[PDB]
């Protein structure tokens, strides 16, 4: 059937007609613009427009296509940048994909799932050690503005090119999806450039719902990304999806709901914000061996104001996630970059999403860092301390100086194991803290020059036998002999 | 003896400074209290008039 | 002031009672030989 526009304003239309409309279907005007029907009132119909409202004219004919709002899926998206609806914006060719998928869908149930056991190598040291991440997990990256969240996510994306290049088994490769809500196109272009400069786009796609783009696209983009990732999840191929920032999506939803004359709630938001984020994040899952064995990891991002996680959106997304990676400005300016607060940051999965070789070191590291955090304040004042307490302070300072990293400079798992071994067994206590930043680098080059076999063995066996232990100890001794530092 | 005299003087100054900080924080607390009341009430009213 | 005082208190108590536990561990097995596995 067809209908006619009755009212138009602020990217929203009120129609008269189309009595056979499905709630949530696409609608087409007589000028190419599209819309989505949400409020099926009695007299009129409330449509949200996918673009500017200058085209609609209060009398224009309108037609229903019968399609529920859907997006394309497949490997045709890899290497491409697309909008919320799958339309490309890279400017190079169309999207070669035949199979589509509905945006809003029912998450998978309790039975076709399994526990999280495989890790998702983030490339960082503090995350992969103290706040591990699994495949099928939903871990939040929450912080303030300009603290290193997008950087964490982009390093997670970049670390995968070595793992993917050194195989042709799709069951082991990890594909990636970056959803940019509210960002400006300059930032998205910078991210695309940073990924292309490192050949990290042949396994990624991007979904850009920027600020100039209307509210419905910002509201739909994360669901479009989850739909694109469900192809990997159900096909047996692992994928990780990153949402930057989710809060922007909540703001867009508030805008749409307020312009549809729906009543507000707390902070002018609706009550359906929890349902919005639960709908979105429960689609991340680790499926069973009967459903292929795929996965869809999620790494949402949230920007708090003044570190207030007592707010309305942070509280919800904290209560519906399997972890937290807090980021602070005090730690960011003190010198700790990434600025991960290892106290508040947790991971309910934990060691199950960690390699044994990393377990052996990270347990001791977490214990030592707890003790160091406990006595750090007392130590600053300056009072006589026992040798054991001083040793604790020295080891905590060493480990804190170890977990620092440059931007876009991730590392393999075996190298993290080796470095944290050097840090835990006491080969950094006498050394000057400020010197460690090169002890790391040189040591890495050394074990990539003359000790590739240790790395291959750790990569294959994924553990530290006594033989590899002794070999690594001998390598560290040779390295300290060949080199000299301030202590 | 000099140590104890200086200790008494320092405690005096610290108590005075604490009183000053208490005054400032009391002002801020009352401001935030009024803001909370106004914000909650405006939320309720805006939800009541959008019916 | 809040986190400052809390962490200072925790560190001070930790250090004090670590020293005391070191001394008690030194002087335990003498005054309580029934627990000492040397005599068992």
């Amino acid at each position: 059937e067809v209908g006619r526009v009755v009212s138009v304003g602020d990217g929203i239309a009120r129609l008269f007609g189309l009595e056979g409309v499905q709630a949530g279907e696409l609608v087409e005007f007589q000028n190419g613009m599209t819309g989505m029907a949400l409020n099926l009132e009695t007299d009129n119909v409330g449509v949200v427009i996918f673009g500017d409202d200058r085209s609609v004219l209060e009398g224009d004919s309108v037609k229903r296509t019968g399609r529920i709002v859907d997006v394309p899926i497949g490997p045709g998206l890899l290497g491409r940048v697309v909008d919320a609806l799958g339309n490309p914006i890279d400017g190079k060719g169309p999207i070669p994909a035949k199979e589509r998928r509905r945006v809003e869908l029912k998450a998978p149930g309790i039975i076709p799932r399994k526990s999280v056991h495989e890790p998702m190598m983030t490339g960082l040291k503090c995350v992969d050690a103290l706040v591990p991440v699994g495949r099928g997990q939903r871990e939040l990256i929450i912080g303030d503005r300009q603290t290193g969240k997008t950087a964490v996510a982009v390093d997670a994306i970049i670390n995968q090119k070595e793992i993917n290049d050194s195989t042709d088994d799709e069951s082991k490769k990890l594909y990636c999806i970056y959803v940019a809500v509210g960002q400006k196109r300059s930032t998205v272009a910078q991210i695309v450039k940073a990924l292309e400069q490192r050949d990290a786009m042949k396994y990624t796609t991007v979904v850009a719902a920027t600020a100039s783009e209307a509210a419905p696209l910002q509201f739909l983009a994360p669901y479009s990304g989850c739909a694109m990732g469900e192809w990997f999840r159900d096909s047996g191929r692992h994928c990780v999806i990153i949402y930057d920032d989710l809060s922007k999506q909540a703001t867009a939803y508030r805008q749409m709901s307020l312009l549809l004359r729906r009543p507000p709630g707390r902070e002018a938001y609706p009550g359906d914000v929890f349902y919005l984020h639960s709908r979105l994040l429960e689609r991340a899952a680790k499926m069973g061996d009967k459903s292929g064995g795929g996965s869809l990891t999620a790494l949402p991002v949230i920007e708090t104001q003044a570190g207030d996680v007592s707010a309305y959106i942070p509280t919800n997304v904290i209560s519906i996630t399997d972890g937290q990676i807090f980021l602070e400005t005090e730690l960011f300016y003190k010198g700790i970059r990434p600025a991960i607060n290892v106290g508040l940051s947790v991971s309910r999965v934990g060691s199950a999403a960690q390699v044994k070789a990393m377990k052996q070191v990270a347990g001791t590291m977490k214990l030592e860092l707890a003790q160091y955090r406990e006595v750090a304040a007392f130590a600053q004042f300056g009072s006589d301390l026992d040798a054991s307490t001083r040793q604790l302070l020295t080891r905590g300072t060493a480990l804190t100086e170890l977990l620092k990293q440059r931007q876009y400079s991730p590392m393999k798992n075996s190298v993290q194991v080796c470095v944290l071994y050097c840090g835990v067994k006491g080969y950094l206590d006498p050394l000057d803290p400020k010197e460690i930043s090169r002890f790391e680098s040189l040591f890495i080059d050394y074990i990539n020059a003359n000790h590739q076999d240790i790395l291959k063995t750790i990569e294959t066996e994924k553990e530290l036998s006594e033989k590899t232990e002794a070999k690594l100890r001998a390598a560290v001794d040779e390295f300290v002999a060949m080199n000299e530092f301030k202590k | 003896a000099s140590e104890q005299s200086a200790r008494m003087s320092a405690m005096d100054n610290a108590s005075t400074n604490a009183g000053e900080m208490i005054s400032s924080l009391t002002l801020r607390y009352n401001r935030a209290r009024q803001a909370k009341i106004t914000t909650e009430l405006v939320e309720i009213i805006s939800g009541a008039n959008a019916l | 002031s809040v986190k400052f005082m809390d962490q200072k208190r925790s560190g001070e108590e930790t250090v004090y009672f670590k020293k005391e536990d070191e001394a008690l561990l030194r002087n335990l097995l003498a005054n309580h030989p029934e627990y000492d596995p040397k005599y068992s």
């Binding site: 003044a306 207030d308 007592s310 | 208490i22 924080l25 607390y29 935030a32 909370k36 | 809040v2 005082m5």
Partner: peptide, 12 residues
């Protein structure tokens, strides 16, 4: 906020 200022006042 309120909890922050109240906690600070209590401590002081």
């Amino acid at each position: 906020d309120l909890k922050i200022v109240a906690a600070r006042m209590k401590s002081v």
